[PDB]
Amino acid sequence: SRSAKKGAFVDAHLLKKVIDMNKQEKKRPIKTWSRRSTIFPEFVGNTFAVHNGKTFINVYVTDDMVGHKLGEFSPTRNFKQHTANR
Amino acid sequence: AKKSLKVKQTRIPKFAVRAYTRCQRCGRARAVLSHFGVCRLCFRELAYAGAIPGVKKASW
Amino acid sequence: QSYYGLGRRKSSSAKVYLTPTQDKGKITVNRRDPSEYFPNKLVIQDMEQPLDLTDLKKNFDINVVVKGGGFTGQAGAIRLGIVRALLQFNPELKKILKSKKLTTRDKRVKERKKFGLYGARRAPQFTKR
Amino acid sequence: MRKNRAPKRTVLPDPVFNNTLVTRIINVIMEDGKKGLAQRILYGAFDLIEQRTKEKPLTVFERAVGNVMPRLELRVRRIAGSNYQVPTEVPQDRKIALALRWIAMFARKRHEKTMLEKIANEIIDASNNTGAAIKKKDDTHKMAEANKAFAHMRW
Amino acid sequence: NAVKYPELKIKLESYDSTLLDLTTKKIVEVVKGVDVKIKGPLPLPTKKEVITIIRSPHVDKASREQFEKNRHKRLMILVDVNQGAIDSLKRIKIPVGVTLRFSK
Amino acid sequence: GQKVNSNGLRFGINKNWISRWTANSHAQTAKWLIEDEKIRNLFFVNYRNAQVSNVEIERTQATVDVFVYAAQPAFLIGSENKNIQKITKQIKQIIGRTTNLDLTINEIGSPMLSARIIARDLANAIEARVPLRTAMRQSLIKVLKAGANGIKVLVSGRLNGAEIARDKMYIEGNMPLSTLRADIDYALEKAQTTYGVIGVKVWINRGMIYTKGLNRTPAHILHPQKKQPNRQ
RNA sequence: GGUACACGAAAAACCUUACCUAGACUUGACAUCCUUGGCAAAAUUAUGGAAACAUAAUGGAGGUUAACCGAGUGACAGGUGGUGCAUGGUUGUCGUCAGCUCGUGUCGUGAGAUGUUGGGUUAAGUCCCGCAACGAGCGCAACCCUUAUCGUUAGUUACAUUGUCUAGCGAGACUGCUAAUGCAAAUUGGAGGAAGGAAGGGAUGACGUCAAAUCAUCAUGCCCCUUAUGUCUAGGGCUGCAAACGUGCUACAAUGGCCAAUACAAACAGUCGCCAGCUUGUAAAAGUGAGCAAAUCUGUAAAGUUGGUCUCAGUUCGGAUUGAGGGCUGCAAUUCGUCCUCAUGAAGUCGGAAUCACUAGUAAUCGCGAAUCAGCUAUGUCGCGGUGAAUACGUUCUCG
RNA sequence: CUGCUGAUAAGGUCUUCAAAA
Ligand SMILES: [Mg+2]
Ligand SMILES: [Mg+2]
Ligand SMILES: [Mg+2]
Ligand SMILES: [Mg+2]
Ligand SMILES: [Mg+2]
Ligand SMILES: [Mg+2]
Ligand SMILES: [Mg+2]
Ligand SMILES: [Mg+2]
Ligand SMILES: [Mg+2]
Ligand SMILES: [Mg+2]
Ligand SMILES: [Mg+2]
Ligand SMILES: [Mg+2]
Ligand SMILES: [Mg+2]
């Protein structure tokens, strides 16, 4: 869907943080709100805490999740069972 | 909350798509006529008062 | 001695030029064969209706200019134009034409859509419960 | 509670066979306001009648409509329970209109190929007093004859 | 004698009609009082804009009224004017509703 | 039921527009439409004691002309033209110093048969705790004595401070509201009472307009002289 | 309920936004009054940052402080917080139905009656007769706009097959003439006429009922909050989902599906736009690039006509759903945009009890345009034209 | 020309005033 000449998209604050934490050996979860950022190849191996709307859900990216959007692996609304009206 | 929203609308945002058109007389956000910059319920009042030149009732 | 007529119908003007000739009428619409201009859906008889019952053996050369409307509207316009030009040749046709009422503007035009209505006169579905 | 009788528009003579019934049945088989399509259907059916019956299409059509054309109508009048029917003589105009409506309705339901052949074969079948519109006319006639008793009381 | 302005195409437009006719009358009167051959004050199709507004403050979208605004338009082209006509034209004082679109 | 605005129904047929200008673009059309509203609202809400019947605004590419018809223009004039400069500076601040202002005060002749000032007097009397029956009766009798046709006054709201809203109407003379030829002047005002808001609507009939045309003529400003200045 | 349910909302990804989570602020994001100086606010570049905001930069238009930029400062600002059963304003409904009243007079102990009922005629309490009533006001009608014929004015950017067309003024239709019957209003028929008896459509909506709707367009009495129910920002939400109803679109098909050629509109809109032509691409579109501030240039008309093919099947119908590759807008398209291509191919073969709209260019049907709009499964709303029907015997029944 | 056809929770606003112009 997204254009070709435009390419992918990251907020680049996430990109700077990812580069820094990749150069650092003792990585920890990266608390990010940018659900719009796509998972770049350099992201692989890190763990992110994405703001689902209320809390920060931890997602561990792999060599496979590369390409999708960062917030796509976390939800925003929860529904599990209805109740009988009558 | 209406005064703060009016003032924020006058103030320029940091993104182009952030900008929306509010009525200039009142502060109504939806149903704004860009030709006149006035919402429908104030356009009716101005037209009935004769403020807008050339805006007469239509018979078709 | 040519004759000129101006008919109208459903917002479609017509300019009909009647020329006296004795080598077949050879009706012509907008420099094109009527059988090709119209869908030839027998609407030709509609425009010939005032030129059939009285006469077309007089072999009037027909020069028609129509700009506007569809094809039935255009046919009605040229019918009215032919009649009105015929009023300029031997006004005795005026009585017979008036008898069957081919010399009156139809006056029927499309109404304007009204707000709250799905059209000129249709109304939304009404639910009571 | 209207106390006004509606006007009537001209029927217009047909510009091919000079028979108004042709224009009437064209308008009856009209759908989506397509005069050209309706006229094509009728004239193709009449040409098929030429090809089959080897007789005059207008004469065959008149023989069909006159035979299908009913005589009595049963008007529903409820008083306490169900409805007791009332046989009344119909005007000629409504008689012809009902004949054409039945012809078209039973023509657009037959099992055959293109509607051209559909209506053509329906007309040729109704020309010999054996058809579906014939069955409809027979049914209403028999129902009126059964309920002949209440003909005196209408309203 | 000189001209200095060939084919001066004055174009008039206004929300009001009668004021437009009066202004065109004054213009043609002055330009005939001076030696200029006016082509003619012809009319052009009037652009009509229609705005539809719901009457009610809250609900009942069905009840809505309409308003119109017409931009009446006239055309008038002068062949040769010269200073003798231009100086007289300077003192016309067209009313505010009328709008000029002089094209030289 | 609901009735269309008497002024709005007659505008563009037998009534000219209170603001007469043609803007450049849609962006400027809103600014010019709001500035005139601010000016008129200023003249009406404040400097009320002068009985300003109506203010008309006339603008070109860059020049603003204001015509203020008032019954007692001495209050606008002030003591040796004092408040005149104050209101001039107020208008200049409202529109802009870059434009040229042409304010013009006009004494309105035969003020009594003007719905705006009749309604303003009604609202002032209501706010001053004057009894309503007496107030409307005196206003109606003075309007009729002024020599006009029927006048209809509708006063609605929390009447006399009551907890249940009522409405009181006085029609005295023929007021054809469906007729378009009639010269009907309609005004509406809000009396801000200690118990809330009272709405006063005054229709006044001033004869029939038998001369076809979009006015372009004064309306009950002409019986005496209508010549006051402050212009250039 | 009728009078809510494609309604407020004529555009919810961010903003809108009023909701939730979280990070920040306190005479405040905005304003006045006062003691007081103006030698700023913006915008942008750095670092910290989810962004609010902080520390440094160019220290800025100007006009000496005019507006605004400040300090001090307490009155206060602020509230889409409650109460539409405290209100103004605006609106729905009975209903464009024909009613609602008043002054004087008279009748009655009185509420009250008369006029307004009675006979004719209308859409009408429209009008005429009668009459203890005589008059009057609002409502009805006409005056207003537009369509139907014509004259005149004007001929470019229309026409230029020469009188269309556009828009100012005017003529025309007035029960005006005639026959019938009625006291008279008036009703019906005929003539001429483009138009005949409210010529078609619109605007126009009486007193009042429903304590009808709106404190969330706006204004406002009263109550409530005042380092928080006020303010800024980031993320989520208004798009959920066993279900039920309303309004619409698409279909179940040969009056048709697909392909090719091709004829005929009106109205409207356009300089962050309409986009002609050309090149590229299976296509959405991209690049180049004229023309147009517009009767000049642009916004492909479709149904329709002809020809070819399918041959009555869950199909060359039907397009839902689903996977993949791309286009555009936008900081950003996952929650949550739409378009194109490829691929898959749910239901559905005319829909139960029961209901809706419509009396001519109407219903049905086919396209075009505009408003809000960066973009939008608006199939919604407001408009325009093309083709273009059937029926009305009558008020027994049904709702009002 | 006589089918059938039953029910509808409680309390409630709304006239302030003529002294008079
Ligand atoms: Mg507010
Ligand atoms: Mg927006
Ligand atoms: Mg629809
Ligand atoms: Mg139902
Ligand atoms: Mg939001
Ligand atoms: Mg400085
Ligand atoms: Mg100083
Ligand atoms: Mg209420
Ligand atoms: Mg009565
Ligand atoms: Mg009596
Ligand atoms: Mg009487
Ligand atoms: Mg009327
Ligand atoms: Mg209520």
Ligand SMILES: [Mg+2]
């Ligand atoms: Mg309601």
Ligand SMILES: [Mg+2]
């Ligand atoms: Mg409030």
Ligand SMILES: [Mg+2]
């Ligand atoms: Mg937010």
Ligand SMILES: [Mg+2]
């Ligand atoms: Mg919603």
Ligand SMILES: [Mg+2]
């Ligand atoms: Mg085919």
Ligand SMILES: [Mg+2]
């Ligand atoms: Mg050209």
Ligand SMILES: [Mg+2]
């Ligand atoms: Mg093209």
Ligand SMILES: [Mg+2]
């Ligand atoms: Mg074909």
Ligand SMILES: [Mg+2]
């Ligand atoms: Mg199946």
Ligand SMILES: [Mg+2]
């Ligand atoms: Mg298919």
Ligand SMILES: [Mg+2]
């Ligand atoms: Mg998406």
Ligand SMILES: [Mg+2]
């Ligand atoms: Mg099948």
Ligand SMILES: [Mg+2]
């Ligand atoms: Mg009707």
Ligand SMILES: [Mg+2]
């Ligand atoms: Mg029963």
Ligand SMILES: [Mg+2]
């Ligand atoms: Mg019981």
Ligand SMILES: [Zn+2]
């Ligand atoms: Zn507004």
